[PDB]
Amino acid sequence: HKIPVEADFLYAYSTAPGYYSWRNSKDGSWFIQSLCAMLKQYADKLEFMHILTRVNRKVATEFESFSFDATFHAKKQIPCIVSMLTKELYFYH
């Protein structure tokens, strides 16, 4: 009959609430780099939530910040998947 007006949204954040989000000057942001890499590899293999979970792991384990100021050096990042989806999402139908 009725569905919520807020249903069927997905917000895929690059970083946790309250936190900074890191970009590489030459390769681009950590999140988008990982997103595109994981979609190219798994879009035909995995459901979208599991693709974004690989993205979480890739950003979490493969990236660490560089800075000449110790305030910003050796920092980490975890993305934040926010799902109000009612169904699984496959790009290959």
Add this chain to the structure above:
Amino acid sequence: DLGKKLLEATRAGQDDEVRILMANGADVNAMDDAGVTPLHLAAKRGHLEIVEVLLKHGADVNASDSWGRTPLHLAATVGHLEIVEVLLEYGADVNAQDKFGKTAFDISIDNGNEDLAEIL
């Protein structure tokens, strides 16, 4: 990449190496991923000579890092009066706030800096 070498030379305080790199066309406004410029580094570490040569060649006096801190904020934190004077002469924003709401004047009061409170 000459920008990375310049940032590295500025941090180590190598004045001669800074000039050699600039003469080869290094960007005085080079940044790392956190938006830290050669001027930020020179101001924090008290390198008066390098600050002056950077500003002379058009380095952004009001560039702020990822925490919104300008070279004037960083100079005020350490308490280097001479650098503060030079920054203000190149049009440093006395009213500039970092992403934590503090001005260069606000930092000087926090530290209990007597001489810096009257200049600002």
Add this chain to the structure above:
Amino acid sequence: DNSYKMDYPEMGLCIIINNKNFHKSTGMTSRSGTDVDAANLRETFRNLKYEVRNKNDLTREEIVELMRDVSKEDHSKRSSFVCVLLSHGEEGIIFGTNGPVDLKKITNFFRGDRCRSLTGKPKLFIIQACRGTELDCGIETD
């Protein structure tokens, strides 16, 4: 059924907002490498059969206006909707070149009752932006 219907004639739109350069008064630093992201995203989503539209350096007014116009299009023949935001940010806020935009304001345009041709369809918002100034120091692992 447990899967979204994805066999509509068209896959859907992919709107990319790519903010690189910002007004001096805002004090926000130039976002180096974001052009790489935009190009990488276009390549990826167009290979996924999405209709990609890229917009560079939009003001806060221009963002709200773009999102309103897109929400008032006919999506009845599209499977989904994708919007990627590449800019500065705070919690619940994305930045135009000249200042802040409320994130809830952008997304409200696409609510199930306001964009009828996207009801029951997945609406994907991909957000590359800060959510505050906190830094994660991390912890040692294997």
